[PDB]
Coordinates of C-alpha atoms in Angstrom, one line a residue:
Chain A
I1 CA 100.6 67.5 84.0
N2 CA 97.8 69.6 82.8
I3 CA 96.8 69.8 79.1
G4 CA 97.3 74.0 77.9
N5 CA 99.4 75.7 76.5
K6 CA 101.5 78.1 79.3
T7 CA 103.3 81.7 79.3
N8 CA 106.1 82.3 82.2
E9 CA 109.0 82.6 80.0
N10 CA 112.2 81.2 81.1
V11 CA 115.1 84.0 80.4
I12 CA 118.7 82.2 80.4
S13 CA 121.6 83.5 80.6
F14 CA 124.7 80.9 79.0
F15 CA 128.5 82.6 80.4
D16 CA 128.3 83.1 84.5
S17 CA 131.9 85.4 83.5
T18 CA 131.4 89.2 84.6
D19 CA 128.9 91.6 84.3
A20 CA 128.5 93.3 80.6
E21 CA 128.7 97.0 81.3
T22 CA 132.2 96.6 82.8
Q23 CA 132.9 94.5 80.3
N24 CA 132.7 97.2 77.4
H25 CA 134.0 99.7 79.2
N26 CA 137.3 98.0 80.0
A27 CA 137.1 97.0 76.0
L28 CA 137.1 100.3 75.0
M29 CA 140.0 101.8 76.7
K30 CA 142.0 99.7 74.6
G31 CA 140.4 99.0 71.3
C32 CA 138.5 102.9 70.3
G33 CA 138.5 106.0 72.9
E34 CA 135.0 106.7 72.0
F35 CA 132.0 105.1 73.0
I36 CA 129.0 105.6 70.4
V37 CA 126.0 105.4 72.1
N38 CA 123.1 107.2 70.4
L39 CA 122.2 107.8 66.6
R40 CA 121.6 110.5 66.8
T41 CA 125.0 112.9 66.8
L42 CA 125.5 110.5 63.7
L43 CA 123.4 112.8 61.9
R44 CA 125.6 115.8 63.3
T45 CA 128.6 114.1 61.3
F46 CA 129.7 115.4 57.4
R47 CA 129.3 112.3 55.4
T48 CA 129.2 113.0 51.4
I49 CA 126.5 112.4 49.3
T50 CA 128.3 112.7 46.4
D51 CA 131.3 113.4 44.7
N52 CA 131.1 115.0 41.2
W53 CA 128.1 117.6 41.3
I54 CA 128.0 119.4 37.9
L55 CA 126.5 122.3 37.4
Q56 CA 125.9 125.0 35.0
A57 CA 127.1 128.9 34.9
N58 CA 124.2 131.6 35.8
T59 CA 121.1 128.2 37.1
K60 CA 119.7 128.8 39.6
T61 CA 119.5 124.8 41.2
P62 CA 117.5 123.8 44.2
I63 CA 119.4 121.2 46.4
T64 CA 116.2 119.4 45.9
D65 CA 117.0 118.2 41.5
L66 CA 120.3 116.3 44.3
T67 CA 118.7 115.5 47.5
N68 CA 115.4 113.7 46.2
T69 CA 118.5 111.5 44.1
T70 CA 120.2 110.4 46.6
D71 CA 117.5 110.0 49.5
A72 CA 116.7 106.7 47.7
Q73 CA 119.9 105.7 47.7
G74 CA 120.6 105.1 51.7
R75 CA 124.9 106.1 51.2
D76 CA 124.9 108.4 54.0
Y77 CA 123.3 108.3 57.6
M78 CA 120.3 111.1 57.4
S79 CA 119.6 108.6 54.1
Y80 CA 119.9 105.1 55.7
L81 CA 118.8 106.0 59.4
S82 CA 115.6 107.6 57.8
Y83 CA 114.9 104.6 56.3
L84 CA 114.3 103.3 60.2
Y85 CA 111.8 106.1 61.0
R86 CA 108.5 108.5 59.8
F87 CA 108.8 112.0 60.7
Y88 CA 111.7 114.3 61.2
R89 CA 112.6 117.7 62.7
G90 CA 115.5 120.5 62.6
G91 CA 116.9 122.5 60.3
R92 CA 120.0 120.7 57.9
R93 CA 123.8 121.7 57.2
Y94 CA 126.1 122.0 53.9
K95 CA 129.1 122.1 52.8
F96 CA 130.4 122.7 49.1
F97 CA 134.0 121.7 48.4
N98 CA 134.7 123.4 45.4
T99 CA 136.5 120.6 42.8
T100 CA 136.0 122.9 39.6
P101 CA 139.1 123.7 37.1
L102 CA 138.8 127.5 38.2
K103 CA 140.0 129.9 35.5
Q104 CA 141.9 133.3 36.5
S105 CA 140.5 135.5 33.8
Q106 CA 136.9 135.5 36.4
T107 CA 135.5 136.2 40.1
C108 CA 134.2 132.7 40.9
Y109 CA 131.1 133.2 43.7
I110 CA 128.7 131.5 45.7
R111 CA 125.1 132.4 46.2
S112 CA 123.2 130.4 48.3
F113 CA 119.4 131.2 48.9
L114 CA 116.4 129.6 50.1
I115 CA 114.1 128.1 48.5
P116 CA 110.7 126.0 50.4
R117 CA 110.7 122.5 49.8
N118 CA 109.8 120.8 46.0
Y119 CA 109.4 124.4 43.9
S120 CA 110.9 124.7 40.9
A121 CA 113.6 127.9 40.4
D122 CA 111.5 129.9 38.6
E123 CA 108.3 130.4 41.4
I124 CA 110.6 131.7 43.9
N125 CA 112.2 134.9 44.1
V126 CA 115.9 135.9 45.4
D127 CA 115.0 138.3 48.6
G128 CA 116.7 136.3 51.8
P129 CA 118.7 136.0 53.2
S130 CA 122.1 134.8 51.3
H131 CA 125.6 134.1 51.8
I132 CA 128.5 134.2 49.1
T133 CA 131.8 133.0 48.8
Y134 CA 134.5 132.9 46.6
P135 CA 136.1 130.0 45.8
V136 CA 139.6 131.1 45.4
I137 CA 139.9 131.8 48.8
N138 CA 137.4 130.1 50.2
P139 CA 136.3 126.8 49.2
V140 CA 134.3 125.7 51.0
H141 CA 130.9 127.2 51.4
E142 CA 129.5 125.8 54.7
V143 CA 125.7 126.8 54.6
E144 CA 122.7 126.5 57.6
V145 CA 119.1 125.9 56.5
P146 CA 116.8 126.7 59.3
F147 CA 113.7 125.0 60.3
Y148 CA 111.0 127.4 58.7
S149 CA 108.3 124.7 58.8
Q150 CA 104.1 125.4 59.6
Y151 CA 104.2 121.9 60.9
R152 CA 105.4 120.9 64.0
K153 CA 107.5 117.6 62.4
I154 CA 107.5 116.5 58.3
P155 CA 106.8 113.2 57.3
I156 CA 108.0 111.3 54.0
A157 CA 106.1 112.2 50.3
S158 CA 102.7 113.7 52.0
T159 CA 100.1 115.2 49.8
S160 CA 99.5 118.1 47.8
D161 CA 100.4 120.7 50.2
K162 CA 103.7 121.3 48.6
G163 CA 106.5 124.3 49.8
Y164 CA 105.4 124.2 54.1
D165 CA 108.9 124.2 55.3
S166 CA 112.5 125.9 53.4
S167 CA 115.6 124.7 51.6
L168 CA 118.3 125.1 49.7
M169 CA 118.7 127.3 46.9
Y170 CA 122.5 127.1 44.8
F171 CA 123.4 129.6 42.2
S172 CA 126.5 130.1 40.6
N173 CA 128.2 132.3 38.0
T174 CA 130.3 129.6 36.4
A175 CA 130.2 126.0 35.2
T176 CA 131.0 125.0 38.6
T177 CA 131.3 121.2 40.0
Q178 CA 131.4 119.8 43.8
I179 CA 131.9 117.5 46.7
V180 CA 128.2 117.8 48.7
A181 CA 128.3 116.8 52.5
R182 CA 125.9 117.1 54.5
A183 CA 124.1 116.4 58.3
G184 CA 122.0 117.9 60.6
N185 CA 121.7 120.8 62.7
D186 CA 121.4 121.2 66.2
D187 CA 118.1 120.6 66.1
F188 CA 117.9 117.9 63.9
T189 CA 116.6 114.7 64.9
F190 CA 114.1 111.7 63.4
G191 CA 111.5 109.6 65.3
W192 CA 108.3 107.0 65.1
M193 CA 110.6 104.5 65.0
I194 CA 109.2 101.4 61.9
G195 CA 111.1 98.4 60.7
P196 CA 114.3 98.3 58.6
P197 CA 113.9 97.4 55.1
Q198 CA 116.3 95.3 53.1
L199 CA 120.2 95.6 51.9
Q200 CA 122.8 94.9 48.7
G201 CA 125.5 93.5 48.5
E202 CA 127.0 92.8 45.1
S203 CA 126.9 92.6 41.6
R204 CA 129.8 90.3 40.1
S205 CA 127.5 89.7 36.6
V206 CA 128.5 86.2 36.7
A207 CA 129.3 84.6 33.3
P208 CA 126.5 82.7 32.2
Chain B
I1 CA 86.6 69.8 85.4
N2 CA 89.6 70.8 83.9
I3 CA 91.7 67.8 81.4
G4 CA 94.8 66.9 83.2
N5 CA 95.8 64.0 85.5
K6 CA 96.7 64.1 88.8
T7 CA 98.4 63.9 92.0
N8 CA 97.5 65.0 96.1
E9 CA 96.8 61.2 97.5
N10 CA 93.9 60.3 99.3
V11 CA 95.8 58.5 102.7
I12 CA 92.0 56.6 103.7
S13 CA 91.9 54.5 107.3
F14 CA 89.5 51.9 108.1
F15 CA 87.7 51.1 110.9
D16 CA 88.3 54.1 113.5
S17 CA 89.4 51.7 116.7
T18 CA 92.2 52.8 118.8
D19 CA 95.8 53.5 117.8
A20 CA 97.3 50.2 116.9
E21 CA 100.8 50.1 118.9
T22 CA 98.1 50.2 121.9
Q23 CA 96.9 47.4 120.3
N24 CA 99.5 45.5 119.5
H25 CA 101.6 45.7 123.1
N26 CA 98.2 45.0 124.3
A27 CA 98.1 41.3 122.1
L28 CA 101.8 40.1 123.0
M29 CA 101.1 40.4 126.7
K30 CA 99.4 37.8 126.0
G31 CA 100.6 35.8 123.2
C32 CA 103.6 35.9 122.7
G33 CA 105.6 38.0 125.8
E34 CA 108.3 38.6 123.4
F35 CA 108.8 40.8 121.2
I36 CA 111.2 40.8 117.6
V37 CA 111.7 44.0 116.4
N38 CA 114.8 44.0 114.0
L39 CA 115.7 40.8 111.4
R40 CA 119.2 41.3 112.6
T41 CA 118.6 40.0 116.3
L42 CA 118.0 36.3 114.3
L43 CA 120.9 36.0 112.8
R44 CA 122.2 35.5 116.8
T45 CA 120.5 32.5 116.8
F46 CA 121.9 29.6 116.2
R47 CA 119.5 27.0 113.2
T48 CA 120.5 23.9 111.8
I49 CA 122.3 23.6 108.6
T50 CA 122.6 20.0 108.4
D51 CA 121.3 17.0 110.1
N52 CA 123.9 14.8 108.6
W53 CA 127.5 16.2 107.6
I54 CA 129.3 13.3 107.3
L55 CA 133.2 13.2 106.9
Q56 CA 136.5 10.5 106.8
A57 CA 139.6 10.5 109.7
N58 CA 142.2 12.8 108.4
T59 CA 141.2 14.9 106.0
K60 CA 141.4 18.9 106.7
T61 CA 137.4 20.1 105.5
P62 CA 136.5 23.9 104.9
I63 CA 133.5 24.9 105.6
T64 CA 132.6 25.8 102.2
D65 CA 132.5 22.9 100.7
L66 CA 129.5 22.8 103.2
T67 CA 128.6 26.5 103.2
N68 CA 128.7 26.3 99.4
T69 CA 125.8 24.1 99.2
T70 CA 123.6 25.4 101.1
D71 CA 123.3 29.1 101.0
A72 CA 121.6 29.0 97.8
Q73 CA 119.2 27.0 99.9
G74 CA 117.8 29.4 101.9
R75 CA 117.1 26.9 104.8
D76 CA 118.6 28.6 108.4
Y77 CA 118.4 32.8 108.4
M78 CA 121.8 33.4 107.7
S79 CA 120.9 32.1 103.9
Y80 CA 117.3 33.0 104.4
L81 CA 117.3 36.6 104.9
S82 CA 120.9 36.6 102.7
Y83 CA 118.1 37.2 99.4
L84 CA 117.1 40.5 100.8
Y85 CA 120.2 42.1 101.4
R86 CA 123.4 42.5 99.0
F87 CA 126.9 43.2 101.3
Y88 CA 127.4 41.6 104.4
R89 CA 129.8 42.3 107.7
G90 CA 131.6 40.6 111.0
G91 CA 132.4 37.5 112.0
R92 CA 130.5 34.2 112.2
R93 CA 130.3 31.0 114.5
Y94 CA 129.5 28.1 114.4
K95 CA 128.6 24.9 116.2
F96 CA 129.1 21.4 115.8
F97 CA 127.2 18.5 117.6
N98 CA 128.4 15.3 118.0
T99 CA 126.3 11.9 116.1
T100 CA 129.2 9.7 115.9
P101 CA 129.0 6.1 117.0
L102 CA 132.4 6.3 117.9
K103 CA 135.0 3.8 119.9
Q104 CA 136.1 3.6 122.6
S105 CA 139.6 2.1 122.3
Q106 CA 140.4 5.6 120.5
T107 CA 140.9 9.2 121.2
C108 CA 139.1 11.5 118.9
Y109 CA 139.6 15.0 119.1
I110 CA 137.8 17.6 116.7
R111 CA 140.4 20.5 115.5
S112 CA 139.5 23.8 114.0
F113 CA 141.8 26.2 112.1
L114 CA 142.0 29.9 110.4
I115 CA 141.2 29.1 106.5
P116 CA 140.9 32.3 103.7
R117 CA 137.7 32.0 102.8
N118 CA 137.6 29.4 99.3
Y119 CA 140.7 28.7 99.4
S120 CA 141.3 24.3 99.5
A121 CA 143.1 22.1 102.3
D122 CA 146.4 21.6 100.6
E123 CA 147.0 26.2 99.5
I124 CA 147.1 26.5 103.4
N125 CA 149.1 25.8 106.5
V126 CA 147.7 25.2 110.3
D127 CA 149.9 28.2 112.4
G128 CA 147.1 29.9 113.5
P129 CA 144.6 30.6 116.4
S130 CA 143.1 27.0 116.8
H131 CA 140.7 24.9 119.1
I132 CA 140.2 21.6 120.3
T133 CA 137.7 19.7 121.7
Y134 CA 136.5 15.7 122.9
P135 CA 133.7 14.6 121.5
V136 CA 134.0 11.9 124.5
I137 CA 133.3 14.8 127.5
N138 CA 132.0 17.5 125.1
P139 CA 130.1 15.9 122.3
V140 CA 129.6 20.4 121.2
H141 CA 132.8 21.9 119.4
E142 CA 131.6 25.4 119.7
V143 CA 133.9 28.4 117.6
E144 CA 134.5 31.3 116.2
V145 CA 135.8 32.8 113.3
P146 CA 136.3 37.0 113.3
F147 CA 136.0 39.3 111.2
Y148 CA 139.7 39.8 109.4
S149 CA 139.1 41.3 105.9
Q150 CA 141.1 43.7 103.7
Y151 CA 137.0 45.2 102.7
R152 CA 135.2 47.0 105.0
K153 CA 132.2 45.0 103.4
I154 CA 131.9 42.1 101.2
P155 CA 129.7 41.4 98.4
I156 CA 128.1 37.9 97.1
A157 CA 130.3 36.4 94.4
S158 CA 132.9 38.3 93.6
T159 CA 135.7 38.4 90.5
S160 CA 138.5 36.7 90.4
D161 CA 140.8 38.3 94.0
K162 CA 140.0 35.1 95.8
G163 CA 141.3 35.1 100.0
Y164 CA 140.2 38.0 101.3
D165 CA 138.7 37.5 104.7
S166 CA 139.3 34.3 107.2
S167 CA 136.5 31.3 107.8
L168 CA 137.0 27.5 109.2
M169 CA 138.8 24.8 108.7
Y170 CA 137.9 21.1 110.0
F171 CA 139.9 18.6 112.0
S172 CA 139.0 15.3 112.8
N173 CA 141.2 12.2 113.9
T174 CA 138.4 10.1 113.1
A175 CA 135.1 9.6 110.3
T176 CA 132.6 11.6 112.3
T177 CA 128.5 12.5 111.7
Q178 CA 128.2 15.8 113.0
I179 CA 124.8 18.5 112.7
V180 CA 126.3 21.8 112.0
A181 CA 123.9 25.2 113.4
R182 CA 126.3 29.0 112.3
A183 CA 124.9 32.3 113.5
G184 CA 126.7 35.6 113.2
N185 CA 128.5 37.2 115.9
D186 CA 128.0 40.2 118.0
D187 CA 129.1 42.6 115.3
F188 CA 127.4 40.6 112.2
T189 CA 124.9 41.9 110.0
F190 CA 123.7 42.3 106.5
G191 CA 123.0 45.8 103.9
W192 CA 122.1 47.6 101.4
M193 CA 118.4 46.4 100.6
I194 CA 117.0 44.6 96.7
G195 CA 113.8 42.9 96.7
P196 CA 113.1 39.4 97.3
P197 CA 113.3 36.1 95.1
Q198 CA 111.1 33.5 94.6
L199 CA 109.8 31.0 97.2
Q200 CA 108.9 26.8 96.3
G201 CA 106.5 24.6 98.0
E202 CA 105.1 21.5 98.1
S203 CA 106.5 19.2 95.6
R204 CA 103.2 15.9 95.2
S205 CA 104.3 14.2 92.5
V206 CA 100.6 14.0 91.0
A207 CA 99.4 10.4 89.4
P208 CA 99.5 11.9 85.7
Chain C
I1 CA 94.1 78.9 78.0
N2 CA 94.4 75.3 79.4
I3 CA 90.9 73.4 78.8
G4 CA 89.1 72.5 80.5
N5 CA 85.7 74.6 81.3
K6 CA 85.0 76.4 83.7
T7 CA 82.4 78.7 86.7
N8 CA 83.2 82.3 88.1
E9 CA 79.8 83.5 86.4
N10 CA 79.9 87.4 85.9
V11 CA 76.8 89.3 87.0
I12 CA 76.5 92.8 85.3
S13 CA 74.4 95.1 84.8
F14 CA 73.3 97.0 82.3
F15 CA 71.8 100.9 83.1
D16 CA 73.5 102.4 85.0
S17 CA 70.9 104.3 86.5
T18 CA 70.4 104.3 90.2
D19 CA 69.7 101.8 92.8
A20 CA 66.1 100.9 92.0
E21 CA 64.5 100.5 95.2
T22 CA 64.1 104.0 94.9
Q23 CA 62.8 104.1 91.8
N24 CA 59.9 101.6 92.7
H25 CA 59.8 103.7 95.8
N26 CA 58.7 107.2 93.9
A27 CA 57.3 105.3 91.0
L28 CA 53.9 104.1 93.7
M29 CA 53.7 107.8 94.8
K30 CA 52.3 108.7 91.4
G31 CA 50.4 105.5 90.6
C32 CA 49.2 103.3 93.2
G33 CA 49.4 104.6 96.5
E34 CA 49.5 100.7 97.7
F35 CA 52.2 98.0 98.0
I36 CA 51.3 95.2 97.2
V37 CA 54.2 93.1 98.6
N38 CA 53.3 89.3 100.0
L39 CA 50.8 87.2 98.3
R40 CA 49.6 86.1 101.3
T41 CA 47.4 89.3 101.6
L42 CA 46.0 88.4 98.2
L43 CA 44.2 85.0 100.0
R44 CA 42.1 87.8 102.5
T45 CA 40.6 89.7 99.9
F46 CA 37.2 88.5 99.0
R47 CA 37.1 87.4 95.4
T48 CA 34.0 85.5 93.7
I49 CA 33.8 81.7 92.6
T50 CA 31.0 81.4 91.3
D51 CA 27.4 84.3 90.0
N52 CA 25.1 82.2 90.3
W53 CA 25.2 79.0 92.3
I54 CA 21.7 77.7 92.0
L55 CA 19.7 75.5 95.1
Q56 CA 16.5 73.4 96.3
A57 CA 14.8 73.9 99.0
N58 CA 15.2 72.3 102.0
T59 CA 18.4 69.8 100.8
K60 CA 21.6 70.2 103.3
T61 CA 24.2 71.1 101.4
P62 CA 27.9 71.2 101.4
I63 CA 30.4 72.8 100.2
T64 CA 31.9 70.7 98.8
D65 CA 30.1 70.4 95.8
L66 CA 31.0 73.8 94.6
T67 CA 34.7 74.1 96.1
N68 CA 35.9 70.5 94.6
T69 CA 34.6 72.2 91.1
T70 CA 36.4 75.7 91.4
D71 CA 39.4 74.6 92.8
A72 CA 40.3 72.8 89.7
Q73 CA 40.4 76.2 86.8
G74 CA 41.8 78.5 88.8
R75 CA 39.5 81.5 88.9
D76 CA 39.8 83.3 92.0
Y77 CA 43.1 83.9 94.8
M78 CA 42.9 80.2 96.6
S79 CA 42.5 77.9 93.7
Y80 CA 44.8 80.3 91.4
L81 CA 48.3 80.1 94.1
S82 CA 46.9 77.1 94.9
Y83 CA 48.7 75.7 91.8
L84 CA 51.7 76.7 93.2
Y85 CA 52.5 75.1 96.3
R86 CA 51.7 71.4 97.8
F87 CA 50.1 72.5 101.5
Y88 CA 47.8 74.4 103.5
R89 CA 47.0 75.5 107.1
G90 CA 44.8 77.6 108.0
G91 CA 41.0 78.4 108.1
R92 CA 38.2 80.2 105.6
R93 CA 35.6 81.9 105.2
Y94 CA 32.9 82.9 102.9
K95 CA 30.7 85.8 101.9
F96 CA 26.5 83.8 99.9
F97 CA 25.8 87.4 98.2
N98 CA 21.8 87.1 97.5
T99 CA 20.3 87.0 94.2
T100 CA 17.1 85.2 94.4
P101 CA 13.6 86.8 93.5
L102 CA 11.8 86.6 96.5
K103 CA 8.4 86.1 98.2
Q104 CA 7.4 88.3 101.0
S105 CA 4.2 85.6 101.8
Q106 CA 7.7 83.1 103.4
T107 CA 9.7 83.2 105.2
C108 CA 13.9 82.4 103.7
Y109 CA 16.5 82.2 106.4
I110 CA 20.1 80.5 105.9
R111 CA 21.7 78.3 107.9
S112 CA 25.4 76.8 108.2
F113 CA 26.9 74.0 109.6
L114 CA 29.5 72.1 109.2
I115 CA 30.8 68.7 108.6
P116 CA 33.8 67.7 108.4
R117 CA 35.9 67.5 105.1
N118 CA 34.3 64.4 102.0
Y119 CA 31.5 63.7 103.7
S120 CA 27.7 63.7 102.1
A121 CA 25.0 65.3 103.8
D122 CA 23.1 62.3 105.1
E123 CA 25.7 61.3 107.5
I124 CA 26.9 63.8 109.4
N125 CA 24.2 66.0 112.5
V126 CA 22.6 69.1 113.2
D127 CA 24.3 69.9 115.7
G128 CA 27.2 72.2 116.0
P129 CA 28.0 75.7 116.1
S130 CA 25.3 78.1 113.6
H131 CA 24.7 81.0 112.2
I132 CA 21.1 81.5 110.2
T133 CA 21.1 85.4 108.7
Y134 CA 17.7 86.3 106.9
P135 CA 17.4 87.9 103.7
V136 CA 15.4 89.9 103.2
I137 CA 16.6 92.3 105.8
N138 CA 20.9 91.0 105.7
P139 CA 21.2 89.6 101.9
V140 CA 25.0 88.7 102.8
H141 CA 25.6 85.6 104.8
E142 CA 29.1 86.1 106.1
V143 CA 30.6 82.9 107.9
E144 CA 33.5 81.6 108.9
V145 CA 34.7 78.0 109.2
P146 CA 38.2 77.9 111.6
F147 CA 40.8 75.1 111.5
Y148 CA 39.9 72.2 113.1
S149 CA 42.0 69.9 111.8
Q150 CA 43.9 66.3 113.3
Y151 CA 46.8 67.7 111.4
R152 CA 49.5 70.5 111.5
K153 CA 49.1 70.8 107.5
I154 CA 46.6 69.5 104.5
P155 CA 48.0 68.0 101.7
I156 CA 46.0 67.7 98.4
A157 CA 44.1 64.7 97.1
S158 CA 45.2 62.4 100.3
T159 CA 44.3 58.7 101.4
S160 CA 40.6 57.1 101.9
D161 CA 41.0 59.0 105.7
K162 CA 38.5 61.5 105.0
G163 CA 37.3 63.7 107.0
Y164 CA 40.4 65.2 109.2
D165 CA 39.0 69.2 109.4
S166 CA 36.3 70.7 109.1
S167 CA 34.5 72.5 106.2
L168 CA 31.3 74.5 106.1
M169 CA 27.2 73.0 105.7
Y170 CA 24.5 74.9 103.7
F171 CA 20.7 74.9 104.7
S172 CA 17.7 77.2 103.7
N173 CA 13.8 76.4 103.3
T174 CA 13.4 78.4 100.3
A175 CA 15.4 77.2 96.4
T176 CA 17.8 80.0 96.2
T177 CA 20.7 81.5 94.0
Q178 CA 23.8 83.2 95.1
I179 CA 27.0 84.8 94.3
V180 CA 29.6 82.4 96.9
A181 CA 32.9 84.5 97.4
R182 CA 35.8 83.8 99.6
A183 CA 39.3 83.9 101.1
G184 CA 41.3 82.8 103.8
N185 CA 40.8 83.9 107.6
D186 CA 43.5 85.4 109.0
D187 CA 45.5 82.7 109.9
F188 CA 45.5 80.8 106.3
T189 CA 48.3 80.7 104.9
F190 CA 50.0 77.9 101.7
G191 CA 53.2 76.6 102.0
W192 CA 56.0 74.2 100.0
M193 CA 57.0 75.8 97.1
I194 CA 56.3 73.9 93.6
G195 CA 56.4 75.5 90.3
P196 CA 53.7 76.5 88.2
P197 CA 51.6 75.0 85.5
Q198 CA 50.3 76.2 82.5
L199 CA 47.9 78.7 81.2
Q200 CA 45.0 78.5 79.0
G201 CA 44.1 82.0 76.1
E202 CA 40.8 82.5 74.5
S203 CA 39.3 80.4 72.6
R204 CA 38.1 81.1 68.6
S205 CA 36.4 78.4 67.5
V206 CA 38.0 79.4 64.0
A207 CA 36.5 79.2 60.8
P208 CA 37.7 76.0 58.9

């Protein structure tokens, strides 16, 4: 019974029932039918980042006019899981579901181009790999931006070195309004884990 | 030279002379001639519990009118060693040495019966195993009460459950006076040791 | 991280260069040419204890009229190394370099005798082993006192038991003046080490 603090940690487990890895597998044959192991696979499912993205006719719009607003929110999985990590890597996918009250007397088309990140519309050309769809027959514009980077990984909010990896540019001949839903491609991943931020609950606007 | 109390007891023996079990055996071949090992064997030697037990003629007297007075004293070995223990077991023996100024013109006899413990004389019959002696020819009445119990061991001063083991009842046609000396039988033992009480010395009755 | 002082000494050596016993041997092939191992060998080199030992003609002079003055000083090696030790053993050697303005019209000779230690000149005879030199042809009087002792070792400043080992007595027919240089013989050694005394620096005799 000497004097001085000590160590020798005593791991105790209550409830000597059954090894838990058998009980989990027996609980997902009856309640799920699926077994979500990795959070990387939630970066490959398309979750909608907006519901009404209103644009004007004949205006080249980068996705960083939308993504820069919705990265802070943490609504979808690529912006909620990004608060646990500090780097990323890989391309991104997009889907553009049409919700426009279209006219028949025009022919609407949806172009898509590449800009490097955070340039505007006037300081880039339109001579690159593109994709065009027609919303009267194909209301979903599906596009994939690859990973064309100078660096092997990208941080969040870096220095004045801008335009070091590619992104998407949107174009349409008519003033459209869409539902944007993004996900990562087959090589997209985060890394270099940190701890989480806070969360936000309801907003009741109480009487006093 | 760290801080904290410790253990590791240091048994030291003074006087490296000779192993003591040889010295004890060599000291009892010259001073005793006997070697008292066990205290159980002192329960088989008869020690006198009284010197003048005066009775009246034609009166059935239980030994618990005498034993209940002399259990508290601790004079003999069955009442001195009983303060170290809490239980007992087995029968008891008695001897009744006659010290009566007898007459020749009567025929004195000494009956002895069984009562269960702590009954009186009127609430028991006399139909049992008995013993009769004649003090004009046999001045010592030797009797043995067996162990006829409902329980495998008996405590000291139990509940209102009375009469759960047998005892002795005395009878004589004349007013006799005796020397009672008890001991245990071949199965008598104590058990379940506790610590001793105090002892009592002299009583001088000093002048102030 | 218990409470209590401890032990377990951590010998650390700076400068992982090369084993030093190789570096010392490589440094004495280039700077010394000699390797002084033992301090006992410095008791066999003659160092001068005085520079002008003036005597009178026809006077038997013990060396303890000089040695008792110069043992305290610590100038030579036998009086500087003696402050580290408490005993000694063995004989001593002497050399007497002549520095007298001699005359030709006399014949100078230098006798040397034995006294036991600390006697005077009048309480000893001259019948013993002697040595005579002539400073006109042999200016160095070399003599060796052996170890003729009652004890196997001699302390410093003992009791009133005096004259327990031999020493030297000087004699000369003329008033000479010499340079005395002593050393131990082939059996001389100190022993039974103690710690050193203090040392003495300069004496400037400053202006205030």
